[PDB]
Amino acid sequence: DTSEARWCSECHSNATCTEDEAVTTCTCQEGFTGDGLTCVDLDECAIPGAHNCSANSSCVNTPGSFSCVCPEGFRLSPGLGCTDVDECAEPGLSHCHALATCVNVVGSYLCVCPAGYRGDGWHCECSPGSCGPGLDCVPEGDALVCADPCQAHRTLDEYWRSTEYGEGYACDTDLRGWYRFVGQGGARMAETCVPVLRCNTAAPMWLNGTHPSSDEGIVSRKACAHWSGHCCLWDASVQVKACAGGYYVYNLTAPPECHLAYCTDPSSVEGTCEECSIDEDCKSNNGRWHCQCKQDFNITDISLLEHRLECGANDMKVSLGKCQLKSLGFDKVFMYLSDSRCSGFNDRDNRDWVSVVTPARDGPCGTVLTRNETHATYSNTLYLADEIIIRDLNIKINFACSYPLDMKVSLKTALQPMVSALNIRVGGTGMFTVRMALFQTPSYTQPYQGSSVTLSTEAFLYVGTMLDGGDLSRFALLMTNCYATPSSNATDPLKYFIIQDRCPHTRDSTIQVVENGESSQGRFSVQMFRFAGNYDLVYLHCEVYLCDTMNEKCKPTCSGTRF
Amino acid sequence: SALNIRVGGTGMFTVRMALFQTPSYTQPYQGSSVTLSTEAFLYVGTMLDGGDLSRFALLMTNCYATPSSNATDPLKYFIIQDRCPHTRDSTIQVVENGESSQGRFSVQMFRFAGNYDLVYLHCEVYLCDTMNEKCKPTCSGTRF
Amino acid sequence: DTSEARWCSECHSNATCTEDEAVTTCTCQEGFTGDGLTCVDLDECAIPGAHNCSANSSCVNTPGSFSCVCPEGFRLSPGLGCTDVDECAEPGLSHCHALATCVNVVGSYLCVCPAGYRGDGWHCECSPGSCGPGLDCVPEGDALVCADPCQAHRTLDEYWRSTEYGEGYACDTDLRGWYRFVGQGGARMAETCVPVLRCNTAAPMWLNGTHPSSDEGIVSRKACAHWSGHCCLWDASVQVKACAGGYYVYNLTAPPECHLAYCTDPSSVEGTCEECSIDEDCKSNNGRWHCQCKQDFNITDISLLEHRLECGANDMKVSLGKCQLKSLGFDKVFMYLSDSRCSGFNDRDNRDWVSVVTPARDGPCGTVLTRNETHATYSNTLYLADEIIIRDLNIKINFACSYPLDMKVSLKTALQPMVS
Ligand SMILES: *[C@@H]1O[C@H](CO)[C@@H](O[C@@H]2O[C@H](CO)[C@@H](O[C@@H]3O[C@H](CO[C@H]4O[C@H](CO)[C@@H](O)[C@H](O)[C@@H]4O[C@@H]4O[C@H](CO)[C@@H](O)[C@H](O)[C@H]4NC(C)=O)[C@@H](O)[C@H](O[C@H]4O[C@H](CO)[C@@H](O[C@@H]5O[C@H](CO)[C@@H](O)[C@H](O)[C@H]5NC(C)=O)[C@H](O)[C@@H]4O[C@@H]4O[C@H](CO)[C@@H](O[C@@H]5O[C@H](CO)[C@H](O)[C@H](O)[C@H]5O)[C@H](O)[C@H]4NC(C)=O)[C@@H]3O)[C@H](O)[C@H]2NC(C)=O)[C@H](O)[C@H]1NC(C)=O
Ligand SMILES: *[C@@H]1O[C@H](CO)[C@@H](O[C@@H]2O[C@H](CO)[C@@H](O[C@@H]3O[C@H](CO[C@H]4O[C@H](CO)[C@@H](O)[C@H](O)[C@@H]4O[C@@H]4O[C@H](CO)[C@@H](O)[C@H](O)[C@H]4NC(C)=O)[C@@H](O)[C@H](O[C@H]4O[C@H](CO)[C@@H](O[C@@H]5O[C@H](CO)[C@@H](O)[C@H](O)[C@H]5NC(C)=O)[C@H](O)[C@@H]4O[C@@H]4O[C@H](CO)[C@@H](O[C@@H]5O[C@H](CO)[C@H](O)[C@H](O)[C@H]5O)[C@H](O)[C@H]4NC(C)=O)[C@@H]3O)[C@H](O)[C@H]2NC(C)=O)[C@H](O)[C@H]1NC(C)=O
Ligand SMILES: *[C@@H]1O[C@H](CO)[C@@H](O[C@@H]2O[C@H](CO)[C@@H](O[C@@H]3O[C@H](CO[C@H]4O[C@H](CO[C@H]5O[C@H](CO)[C@@H](O)[C@H](O)[C@@H]5O)[C@@H](O)[C@H](O[C@H]5O[C@H](CO)[C@@H](O)[C@H](O)[C@@H]5O)[C@@H]4O)[C@@H](O)[C@H](O[C@H]4O[C@H](CO)[C@@H](O)[C@H](O)[C@@H]4O[C@H]4O[C@H](CO)[C@@H](O)[C@H](O)[C@@H]4O)[C@@H]3O)[C@H](O)[C@H]2NC(C)=O)[C@H](O)[C@H]1NC(C)=O
Ligand SMILES: *[C@@H]1O[C@H](CO)[C@@H](O[C@@H]2O[C@H](CO)[C@@H](O[C@@H]3O[C@H](CO[C@H]4O[C@H](CO[C@H]5O[C@H](CO)[C@@H](O)[C@H](O)[C@@H]5O)[C@@H](O)[C@H](O[C@H]5O[C@H](CO)[C@@H](O)[C@H](O)[C@@H]5O)[C@@H]4O)[C@@H](O)[C@H](O[C@H]4O[C@H](CO)[C@@H](O)[C@H](O)[C@@H]4O[C@H]4O[C@H](CO)[C@@H](O)[C@H](O)[C@@H]4O)[C@@H]3O)[C@H](O)[C@H]2NC(C)=O)[C@H](O)[C@H]1NC(C)=O
Ligand SMILES: *[C@@H]1O[C@H](CO[C@@H]2O[C@@H](C)[C@@H](O)[C@@H](O)[C@@H]2O)[C@@H](O[C@@H]2O[C@H](CO)[C@@H](O[C@@H]3O[C@H](CO)[C@@H](O)[C@H](O)[C@@H]3O)[C@H](O)[C@H]2NC(C)=O)[C@H](O)[C@H]1NC(C)=O
Ligand SMILES: *[C@@H]1O[C@H](CO)[C@@H](O[C@@H]2O[C@H](CO)[C@@H](O[C@@H]3O[C@H](CO)[C@@H](O)[C@H](O)[C@@H]3O)[C@H](O)[C@H]2NC(C)=O)[C@H](O)[C@H]1NC(C)=O
Ligand SMILES: *[C@@H]1O[C@H](CO)[C@@H](O[C@@H]2O[C@H](CO)[C@@H](O[C@@H]3O[C@H](CO)[C@@H](O)[C@H](O)[C@@H]3O)[C@H](O)[C@H]2NC(C)=O)[C@H](O)[C@H]1NC(C)=O
Ligand SMILES: *[C@@H]1O[C@H](CO[C@@H]2O[C@@H](C)[C@@H](O)[C@@H](O)[C@@H]2O)[C@@H](O[C@@H]2O[C@H](CO)[C@@H](O)[C@H](O)[C@H]2NC(C)=O)[C@H](O)[C@H]1NC(C)=O
Ligand SMILES: *[C@@H]1O[C@H](CO[C@@H]2O[C@@H](C)[C@@H](O)[C@@H](O)[C@@H]2O)[C@@H](O[C@@H]2O[C@H](CO)[C@@H](O)[C@H](O)[C@H]2NC(C)=O)[C@H](O)[C@H]1NC(C)=O
C-alpha cells in the first residue's frame, strides 16, 4: 500500500524483498512492526490486531515469523489449538542420553536414568550392583555405563602372585575394577588358608568359598587373609562372576593395608603334571592336583647327610636335592660361599637339584689353591641357610676337588710312513732226516748197532721207522711203497715189494702193519725170507710220503688188495 | 655352634695334543690316520683345553713313541728324556718348553724296525708351578 | 806327737796308717792339713812352715803328696828347680799323633802336622797334593793319611767301558778316589778322540796326553770329552801316577754331567791278536795293535749283495759277514724277524758271521708253511737296521728253504739169513 519501493534498496535487512516483473515491493514479515518500507523490531505477540495462538500457547517471536509454542507435551494444530502428542516419538523434541529414557510430561520432557542408576538423565552415574542382571556399572571414557563384566574386565598375569613364590615385596593398592587371571598367574582365586610370607606378599588373601557355576551372575563372596597364627581373623566381602568359556572375573579392590595380596592356585591345565620333576611324583587325583616325593625323602637326618658333588675340568659344582631341602623345612634355599658375589641358582638341566658354580682358579668366587708335591687341590666352603640371618644352626659344607698333576695322554691319529724298500730273493735247498731201526722184540724196544746180523727163517723180523727231526704233529708218515733188495744198490731189477700201493702184500698172513699214517711211528712186521739164487745177503729199502693231516685223511683204508 | 662334615671329590683336567702340517703350527689333522714320507717334517704341539692358569707351565717330563696304541710296550723310542732333548740326531728340536701352555716338539719321520707298520705317539707331562720352580729346562746338553 | 792313735781305726782314709810292733801311728801325708788323727783336704802350700816349690813351679796338690810342676818344657830337679829338658824324648810327656811331630816349647809342647797338612797335630786333614813325593792323601778308617797311591787305589773291571762297546747306559758319578783298570776293562786311559755313543756312554772321555814313565810321581794331565762334532771342546785336568809292575793309577772324579765316562784302549797283551777273527787280518805294528779286513771287503754294493744261507733239518739260519756290515757303516747290527721275540746274536762258532735261528714249524718265530703237491716250503723275512728306528732305507731280506717231500732211505745193516 504505502510502502511501494522504487528499488529493493528501500527494503531493509528485516523485510523480505520480492521482485515481480522488476517491480519491487517491501513487505515486512511477522515479528517486525511498521508499514513495510521500515519495520523495526517488535514482537508479533504485541501488535495491533494481534496473532492467532491458543490460550495455553505462549507466543514466541522468531526472526521472520511467529510460533505458537504450547506447554511442551502439547503442540498447536491449526483449527484445534494445543493438542496432545508424545514428545519422545520425535528425534527433535527429545535428545535424552543413550541410557536415559525419555518421558513426556505436562510442560516439558524429562530424561530418566533406569532403576538403580543415580543420575539426572544426562550422565547416569550408576553404583555397583545398581545395574540389571548380566550388566555391571563400569566406566567408559568419561561416564559410567552398565556393561557386562565379561567384556569390561582387565586381566592380570603377575607370576609373583603364585602361592609357592615366597620372595619379593608387593602391595595391591593399585587394584580397582574387575580383573581376570590368565597364564602363569593362575586360573582362580585361592580357596584355602595360605601360609605366611607367601604369594610374594607379607599376608596372603584367599577366597572364603567355592566359585559359582558357569554363567551365574555377579555374586558376593567372603574374603579372608592370613597373619600371625590365626587364619581369616578379619573377614571382607568380594564379588565374583562366572563367564562363558570357563573362567571367572573378580572385583579386586585395594586392601585396607599395604601387605595384602590375593593368591591363585596352580592352573594344572594338564591332567598329569609333567612340568613337575620326575623325582616329585605327580598326584593325579580328582580336584587334588599337585606333586610330592615318596617315602624315601620323608626323613630328616639322612637328608642332612644326603648330597652329591661333581668336579669339572674348569669349574666345581656341589648340589643337593630340592625335595630334601623342602622336607627339612627349607622351602626356600639360600646358598652362599666364601665370596658373596657367588650365589646359588636352579640346576636348569635336572630340575630336582639346586647347584652353584665356582671357577677353578685362585681369587674369583673365594676359591684357594692347596698344593703339595703329589698334586694340587682346590678347597672351598658352602654355606646353607633358610634366610639371610641364622638363628639356631649354621651348617657349612666343606668340599674339595683333587686334580691329578701327572696323567697319561695319547695322540689318537696313527701314522703310516712310506719307505723305499729293496727286495732280493734268496733260496736254499734243504733236507729232512729220516732213519729206520731193526728191533728184536715185538714191543720194538732195542735197535741193533752191528753192521750185520744173523737170523733164522722162523724168527720174526720187527722193523720200525722214525723221524729224528721235524716231528710236526700234523705231518704223518705214509708208506708209499717198501721193497727188499739183495744188494745195497737200490736200482736193482730183483725187487720183492712188501708194501705196495699203500696197502699190505698178500699171499702170506704174516705180513702185518700195526700203525701207518696214524703218527710218526710206522712199524711193519714180517717173518724172514731168502732170495732165490746165489744171493746170500738181503737188504731193505723203502720210499715214504709225508702226509698232511689237515687236507688228506692219510689213513690207508685198504679194504683188501684182493677185495 | 656349627657342624662340619668333610666332602671330597676326584677330578680330572683335560689335556690333548695335535698334529700340525706347517712349521707355523696352524692346521690340526682330523682323520683317524695319515700317510707321510721320511723326509717330511713331523710338527706336533700340545695344548690345555682347560685350566689355562698363567702360573701353571707345561713341562715335558718324558715323551716316547710306540708301535701300538698300548702304552705298556717294551719297545719304546724315547724322544724327550729327563726333560732334555734326545741326541744322535740334529733334527730333534723343541722351540718352547716350560715357557707357557704351548709346548711344541719338532722331529722328522722314522719307522720302527721289524714287522711294525704303524707308529703311535705317547707322552707324559708334569705341570710346573712358576711361583716356586724355575721350570725352564736349562739343559746344557745331554752329552755335556 | 799329739796324734798317737790307739788303733788304725783312728787313722782316716786320708792319712797313711803304719803299724810298728803293733803300735799305730797316724801321719797325714802332704796335701792334707791338720794334726794327723784328722786331716781334712787342704793344699799343702799353706801350712805352718810354707813349702819348697820353685818360683816358676806352680804349687800343685796330688792325692798323697805335694808336687811342683814347672812350665812344660822344664822339669824340677832337686836342689836346682826348673831345669831345661826336652819333653818330646819322653813317651809320657808327649802323645802327639803318629804323623804329628812333637816340638817342646816354653810352657807346653805342640804337636805339628807335616808340611802341606792342615791340622792342629791331632787331626791332620791332608788335601790332594799336600803330601810328600811317593805319598798321597787317602782315607784310612776315619782319618786322612798320606799313603802311596800304588797301595791305596781301587780297581775297575767294567767291560762296558770298552770303546767298541756301543750299547748300554752309564753315568760315572760314583767314581771318586784312585782307581786302576785290569782285565777286560783295558790297561790305560784312552788317549784319542773317541766317536760318539761309545764306551757304553753318550759322551766319551779320554786322556789328553801320553802316560808318564814308570815310577814317575803324581803328575797332572789334561782330560777331554767328545760331543756333537767338536772333540775336546771343554778341557778338564786329571792326575795319573805310574806304579812298579808297569801299570798306572788315576784320579777318576765324578764328571760334571751324568753322560760322561772314561774309556780304555784294548789291552792287546799278546803280540799277535789271535783273539780277532782269522778273517779280520791282524795288524802287527809297533804301538798300533788292531785288526781289519783286506781290500776284498772295502766296497759297498757287493757287500750289500753279499750273504750266505743254511737250511737245517729242524732250524733255518741266515748270516752275513760282520766285517761287511762294519764296512757298510753298520758297526752295530740289529737283526729282527716277523716276530720280535726272535733276536739276532753272535755266531759263536766262526766269529766273523752274525746269525739268527728259526724253528722249522708254523707259529713260533713267525715262520709260515707254504705247501704244494710237489713238496712243502717255509718262508720268512729278515729285517736289517743300524738302530731301533729306520730313517732312509728299510731293506728286508726275503729267504726260504725248500724241503723235499719224497726222498730215498736205505737201511744200513745188511742181513745174513740161514737156510737148511
Ligand atoms: C711247488 O713248490 C716248489 C717249492 O716252492 C716250487 O719250486 C720253486 O719255484 C720257485 C719259483 O720259480 C723257485 O724260486 C726261484 O729260484 C731260482 C733259482 O732256483 C735254483 O736255486 C734254488 C735255491 O737253491 C733251487 O731250489 C732251485 O731248484 C734252482 O736250483 C738249480 O739252479 C740251476 C741254476 O743255477 C738250474 O740249472 C737247476 O735246474 C736248478 N735245479 C732244479 C730246478 O732242480 C731263483 O733264481 C728265482 O729268483 C728269480 O725270481 C725272483 C722273483 O721274480 C727274482 O726276484 C726279483 O728280481 C727283480 C730283478 O732284480 C727285482 O726287481 C724284484 O724285486 C725281485 N723280487 C723279489 C721278491 O726279490 C730273482 O731276481 C730271480 O729273477 C729271475 O732269475 C732267473 C734266473 O735265475 C731268470 O731266468 C732267466 O730268464 C732269461 C730270460 O729273461 C733266460 O731265459 C735265462 O736263461 C733264464 O735263466 C728270470 O727271468 C728272472 N725273473 C725276473 C727277472 O723277473 C726264484 O727264487 C724255487 O727255487 C723252486 N724250488 C725248487 C726246490 O724247485 C715249484 O715251482 C712249485 N710248483 C708248482 C706247480 O706250484
Ligand atoms: C698331597 O695332597 C693330596 C691332595 O690333598 C693328599 O691326598 C688327600 O689326603 C686327604 C687326607 O687324608 C684325603 O682326605 C680324606 O679322604 C677320605 C676318602 O678318600 C677317598 O675318597 C676321596 C674322594 O673321592 C679320594 O680322593 C681318595 O683317593 C679316596 O678314594 C679311595 O677310597 C677308597 C675307600 O672307599 C680307598 O680304598 C682307596 O684306596 C681310595 N683311593 C686312593 C687312596 O687312591 C675321607 O674319608 C677322609 O675323611 C676322613 O677325615 C676327615 C677329617 O678328619 C673326617 O671328618 C671329620 O669327621 C669327624 C667324625 O665324624 C667329625 O667330628 C669332624 O668334624 C670331621 N671334620 C671335618 C673337617 O669335617 C671324616 O669323617 C673322615 O674320617 C676318617 O674316615 C676314615 C675312613 O674313610 C677313617 O679310617 C678308618 O680308620 C679305622 C680306625 O679308626 C680303620 O683303620 C678303618 O679301616 C679306616 O678306614 C678315619 O679313621 C677317620 N678319621 C677320623 C674319624 O678322625 C678325608 O676326606 C684325600 O681324599 C686325599 N686325596 C687323594 C686324591 O688322595 C695327600 O695325602 C697329600 N700328601 C702329602 C704327603 O701331604
Ligand atoms: C567391585 O566390587 C567392589 C565392592 O563392592 C566395588 O567397590 C565399592 O563397592 C561399594 C558397594 O557397592 C560402593 O559403596 C556404595 O555402594 C552403594 C550402592 O547403592 C546403590 O545400589 C543399591 C542396591 O545395591 C545393593 O547391592 C549392593 C552390592 O551390589 C550393596 O552394596 C547395596 O548396599 C545394596 O544391597 C541401591 O539400593 C542404592 O540406592 C539407594 O540406597 C543408597 C544407600 O546408600 C542411597 O545412597 C540412595 O540414595 C538410594 O536411596 C544405590 O543405587 C552406593 O549407593 C554408594 O554411593 C555412595 O557414593 C556416591 C559417590 O561416591 C554418593 O553420591 C552416594 O550418596 C553414596 O555416598 C554416601 O553413602 C555411603 C553409604 O555407604 C557412605 O559411604 C558415604 O559416606 C555417603 O554417606 C557407594 O557407591 C563403593 O563406592 C565402591 N567403590 C568403588 C571405588 O567403586 C567396585 O566398584 C566394583 N567394581 C566395579 C563396579 O567395577
Ligand atoms: C784325585 O785328584 C782329584 C783332582 O785333583 C782330587 O779331587 C779334588 O782335588 C782338588 C784339588 O786338590 C781339591 O780341591 C782343593 O785343593 C786344595 C789344595 O790345597 C792344599 O795343597 C796346596 C798345594 O797343592 C798344590 O797342588 C794341588 C794339586 O795337587 C793344587 O790343586 C793346589 O792348588 C796347589 O797347586 C797347599 O798350598 C794348600 O795350602 C794353602 O793354600 C790353600 C788355597 O786354597 C789354602 O786353603 C790353605 O789355607 C793354605 O794357605 C793346601 O795344603 C785344598 O786346600 C782345598 O781345601 C778346601 O776344602 C777344605 C775342606 O773341604 C777346606 O777346609 C779348605 O778351606 C778349602 O776350601 C776353600 O778353598 C777352596 C779353594 O778352591 C774353595 O773351593 C772352597 O770354596 C773354600 O773357599 C780343596 O781340597 C778337592 O777338594 C778334591 N775333591 C775331593 C772330593 O777329593 C781327589 O781328591 C784326588 N784323589 C785322592 C787324593 O785320593
Ligand atoms: C613327611 O611325612 C609327613 C607325615 O609323616 C608321616 O606320618 C608320621 C606319623 C610318620 O609315620 C612318618 O614316617 C610318615 O611319613 C607328611 O605330612 C602329611 O601328614 C599327614 C598326617 O595326617 C598325612 O595325612 C594322612 O595321609 C594318609 C594317606 O592319604 C591318610 O590315610 C591319613 O588318614 C592322613 O590323611 C599326609 O599324607 C602327609 N603328606 C604327605 C605324605 O605327602 C609330609 O608331607 C612328608 N613330607 C614329604 C616331603 O614327603
Ligand atoms: C490447554 O491445555 C489442555 C491440556 O492441559 C488442552 O486440552 C487438550 O486438548 C487436546 C485437543 O483436543 C486433547 O488432545 C486429544 O487427545 C486425544 C487422546 O490422545 C486424541 O484422540 C485427540 O485427537 C486429541 O489429540 C488433549 O487430550 C487435551 N488434554 C486434556 C488434559 O484434556 C486444551 O485444549 C488447551 N487449550 C487450548 C486452547 O488449546
Ligand atoms: C824359671 O824359668 C827359667 C826359664 O824360663 C829357668 O832358667 C832355666 O834354668 C835351667 C836350670 O839351670 C836351665 O837349664 C840348663 O840348660 C842347659 C842347656 O841345656 C844345661 O846344660 C843345664 O844342665 C841346665 O839343664 C835353662 O836353660 C834355663 N832357661 C833359660 C831360658 O835360661 C829358671 O831356672 C827358672 N827358675 C826357677 C826358680 O825354677
Ligand atoms: C484463529 O483463531 C480462531 C479463534 O481462536 C480464538 O482466538 C485465538 C487467538 C485464541 O485466543 C483462542 O483461544 C480463541 O478461541 C480459531 O478458531 C478456534 O476457535 C475456538 C473457539 O474459541 C477455539 O476453542 C479453538 O481453539 C480455535 N482453534 C485454534 C486456536 O486453532 C482459528 O482456528 C484460528 N486459526 C488458526 C489457528 O489458523
Ligand atoms: C828348698 O828350698 C831351697 C831354697 O829355695 C827357695 O825357696 C823355695 C820355696 C823357692 O821359693 C825358691 O825359688 C827359693 O830360692 C832350695 O835351694 C835352692 O836355693 C836357690 C837360692 O834361691 C834357688 O835358686 C834354687 O832354685 C833352690 N833349689 C831348688 C828350689 O831346688 C832347696 O834346693 C830346696 N830343697 C828341695 C827342693 O829339696
Numbering used by the authors:
A (entry chain A): 25 to 587
B (entry chain B): 444 to 587
C (entry chain C): 25 to 444
From the paper:
Glycoprotein 2 (GP2) and uromodulin (UMOD) filaments protect against gastrointestinal and urinary tract infections by acting as decoys for bacterial fimbrial lectin FimH. By combining AlphaFold2 predictions with X-ray crystallography and cryo-EM, we show that these proteins contain a bipartite decoy module whose new fold presents the high-mannose glycan recognized by FimH. The structure rationalizes UMOD mutations associated with kidney diseases and visualizes a key epitope implicated in cast nephropathy.
By combining the crystallographic information on GP2 with AlphaFold2 predictions, we could generate a model of the entire UMOD branch (epidermal growth factor (EGF) domains I–III + decoy module) that was fitted into the cryo-EM density and fused with the coordinates of the filament core to describe the complete protein. Rationalizing previous biochemical studies of this medically crucial interaction, the structure suggests that the epitope adopts a rigid conformation stabilized by its involvement in the C5-C7 and C3-C6 disulfides, close proximity to the N232 glycan and hydrophobic interaction with the C terminus of another subunit within the UMOD filament.
